[PDB]
Design an enzyme around this catalytic site. Structure first.
Site, PDB file in Angstrom:
ATOM      1  N   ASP A 117       0.785  -1.190  -0.051  1.00 16.19           N
ATOM      2  CA  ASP A 117      -0.089   0.089   0.004  1.00 16.19           C
ATOM      3  C   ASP A 117       0.943   1.350  -0.003  1.00 16.19           C
ATOM      4  OD1 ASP A 117      -1.899   1.759   0.578  1.00 16.19           O
ATOM      5  OD2 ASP A 117      -2.844   1.126   2.269  1.00 16.19           O
ATOM      6  N   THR A 118       0.655   1.836  -1.258  1.00  6.41           N
ATOM      7  CA  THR A 118       1.885   3.175  -1.250  1.00  6.41           C
ATOM      8  C   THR A 118       1.349   4.260  -0.667  1.00  6.41           C
ATOM      9  OG1 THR A 118       0.993   3.568  -3.650  1.00  6.41           O
ATOM     10  CG2 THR A 118       3.070   2.251  -3.465  1.00  6.41           C
ATOM     11  N   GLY A 119      -0.101   4.256  -0.206  1.00 12.07           N
ATOM     12  CA  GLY A 119      -0.731   5.484   0.460  1.00 12.07           C
ATOM     13  C   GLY A 119      -0.832   4.970   1.986  1.00 12.07           C
TER      14      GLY A 119
HETATM   15  C1  LIG Z   1      -6.992   7.592   3.191  1.00  6.55           C
HETATM   16  C2  LIG Z   1      -5.807   7.669   3.807  1.00  6.55           C
HETATM   17  C3  LIG Z   1      -4.681   7.260   2.929  1.00  6.55           C
HETATM   18  C4  LIG Z   1      -4.786   6.298   2.003  1.00  6.55           C
HETATM   19  C5  LIG Z   1      -5.051   4.941   2.871  1.00  6.55           C
HETATM   20  C6  LIG Z   1      -5.156   3.578   2.140  1.00  6.55           C
HETATM   21  N1  LIG Z   1      -4.963   2.538   2.669  1.00  6.55           N
HETATM   22  C7  LIG Z   1      -6.041   1.323   2.198  1.00  6.55           C
HETATM   23  C8  LIG Z   1      -5.982   0.033   3.321  1.00  6.55           C
HETATM   24  C9  LIG Z   1      -6.686  -0.983   2.677  1.00  6.55           C
HETATM   25  C10 LIG Z   1      -8.218  -1.382   3.401  1.00  6.55           C
HETATM   26  C11 LIG Z   1      -7.980  -1.643   4.815  1.00  6.55           C
HETATM   27  C12 LIG Z   1      -7.524   1.800   1.943  1.00  6.55           C
HETATM   28  O1  LIG Z   1      -8.207   2.707   2.639  1.00  6.55           O
HETATM   29  N2  LIG Z   1      -7.850   1.518   0.825  1.00  6.55           N
HETATM   30  C13 LIG Z   1      -9.649   1.725   0.636  1.00  6.55           C
HETATM   31  C14 LIG Z   1      -9.625   3.096  -0.236  1.00  6.55           C
HETATM   32  C15 LIG Z   1     -11.042   3.516  -0.788  1.00  6.55           C
HETATM   33  C16 LIG Z   1     -11.538   2.881  -1.868  1.00  6.55           C
HETATM   34  N3  LIG Z   1     -12.636   2.666  -2.291  1.00  6.55           N
HETATM   35  O2  LIG Z   1     -10.588   2.606  -2.800  1.00  6.55           O
HETATM   36  C17 LIG Z   1     -10.390   0.494  -0.243  1.00  6.55           C
HETATM   37  O3  LIG Z   1      -9.381  -0.071  -1.095  1.00  6.55           O
HETATM   38  N4  LIG Z   1     -11.318   0.286  -0.135  1.00  6.55           N
HETATM   39  C18 LIG Z   1     -11.963  -0.973  -0.723  1.00  6.55           C
HETATM   40  C19 LIG Z   1     -12.113  -1.961   0.597  1.00  6.55           C
HETATM   41  C20 LIG Z   1     -10.860  -2.604   0.952  1.00  6.55           C
HETATM   42  C21 LIG Z   1     -10.030  -2.892  -0.193  1.00  6.55           C
HETATM   43  N5  LIG Z   1      -8.541  -3.122   0.363  1.00  6.55           N
HETATM   44  C22 LIG Z   1      -8.342  -4.512   0.655  1.00  6.55           C
HETATM   45  N6  LIG Z   1      -9.252  -5.563   0.712  1.00  6.55           N
HETATM   46  N7  LIG Z   1      -7.093  -4.675   0.816  1.00  6.55           N
HETATM   47  C23 LIG Z   1     -13.415  -0.272  -1.075  1.00  6.55           C
HETATM   48  N8  LIG Z   1     -13.895  -0.682  -2.144  1.00  6.55           N
HETATM   49  O4  LIG Z   1     -13.986   0.209  -0.123  1.00  6.55           O
HETATM   50  N9  LIG Z   1      -3.981   4.716   4.051  1.00  6.55           N
HETATM   51  C24 LIG Z   1      -4.064   4.432   5.093  1.00  6.55           C
HETATM   52  O5  LIG Z   1      -5.453   4.276   5.499  1.00  6.55           O
HETATM   53  C25 LIG Z   1      -2.997   4.322   6.405  1.00  6.55           C
HETATM   54  N10 LIG Z   1      -3.085   5.973   6.737  1.00  6.55           N
HETATM   55  C26 LIG Z   1      -1.964   6.739   6.658  1.00  6.55           C
HETATM   56  O6  LIG Z   1      -1.024   6.375   5.950  1.00  6.55           O
HETATM   57  C27 LIG Z   1      -1.998   8.193   7.124  1.00  6.55           C
HETATM   58  N11 LIG Z   1      -3.352   8.295   7.795  1.00  6.55           N
HETATM   59  C28 LIG Z   1      -4.143   9.390   7.190  1.00  6.55           C
HETATM   60  C29 LIG Z   1      -5.229   9.479   8.269  1.00  6.55           C
HETATM   61  O7  LIG Z   1      -4.136  10.021   6.232  1.00  6.55           O
HETATM   62  C30 LIG Z   1      -0.948   8.066   8.178  1.00  6.55           C
HETATM   63  C31 LIG Z   1      -0.656   9.542   8.738  1.00  6.55           C
HETATM   64  O8  LIG Z   1      -1.109   7.183   9.185  1.00  6.55           O
HETATM   65  C32 LIG Z   1      -3.210   3.493   7.231  1.00  6.55           C
HETATM   66  C33 LIG Z   1      -3.249   2.172   6.476  1.00  6.55           C
HETATM   67  C34 LIG Z   1      -2.284   3.525   8.468  1.00  6.55           C
HETATM   68  C35 LIG Z   1      -0.767   3.606   8.261  1.00  6.55           C
END
Ligand SMILES: CCCC[C@@H](CN[C@@H](CCCC)C(=O)N[C@@H](CCC(N)=O)C(=O)N[C@@H](CCCNC(N)=[NH2+])C(N)=O)NC(=O)[C@@H](NC(=O)[C@@H](NC(C)=O)[C@@H](C)O)[C@@H](C)CC
Length: 99
Positions: free
Chosen positions: A25-27
């Site tokens: 996860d680059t984000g």
């Molecule tokens: C918004 C904040 C920045 C982007 C986000 C991307 N992380 C992924 C993690 C995977 C899920 C647990 C994410 O949220 N992905 C979502 C993005 C929304 C989207 N629709 O694309 C996603 O794919 N969601 C899918 C469901 C989960 C999919 N992923 C999976 N199954 N692996 C979706 N359809 O709803 N980064 C983070 O959440 C990280 N946060 C951060 O890096 C920073 N926090 C802040 C608040 O920016 C730092 C200051 O801590 C977490 C992991 C802590 C280190």
């Protein structure tokens, strides 16, 4: 290796002697892994993203192999829905984005 992004970039990691699947996860600034025990070494932290924050256990200097590449760094443990390899370890394995 090269990983395309047509599907979630999931890879096998080794941590604390245990194999897990995690998302590159680059984000993510940090690495977040579910459950598993470990060191008498950890301290509290809150980390956030979409949906707000969770409480995690921060462990330092944890050896973590990722697709056969050795890394060692901070690992946050808590009820994350998905195991996440963040930039803190992706940088150690020489990972880049390319287009
Ligand atoms: C918004 C904040 C920045 C982007 C986000 C991307 N992380 C992924 C993690 C995977 C899920 C647990 C994410 O949220 N992905 C979502 C993005 C929304 C989207 N629709 O694309 C996603 O794919 N969601 C899918 C469901 C989960 C999919 N992923 C999976 N199954 N692996 C979706 N359809 O709803 N980064 C983070 O959440 C990280 N946060 C951060 O890096 C920073 N926090 C802040 C608040 O920016 C730092 C200051 O801590 C977490 C992991 C802590 C280190």
């Amino acid at each position: 290796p090269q990983i395309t992004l047509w599907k979630r970039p999931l890879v096998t990691i080794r941590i604390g002697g245990q194999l897990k699947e995690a998302l590159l996860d680059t984000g993510a600034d940090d690495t977040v892994i579910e459950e598993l025990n470990l060191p008498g070494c950890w301290k509290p932290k809150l980390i956030g993203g979409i949906x707000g924050f969770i409480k995690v256990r921060q462990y330092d200097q944890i050896p973590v192999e990722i697709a056969g590449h050795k890394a060692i760094g901070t690992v946050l443990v808590g009820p994350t829905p998905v195991n996440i390899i963040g930039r803190n370890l992706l940088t150690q394995i020489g990972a880049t984005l390319n287009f």
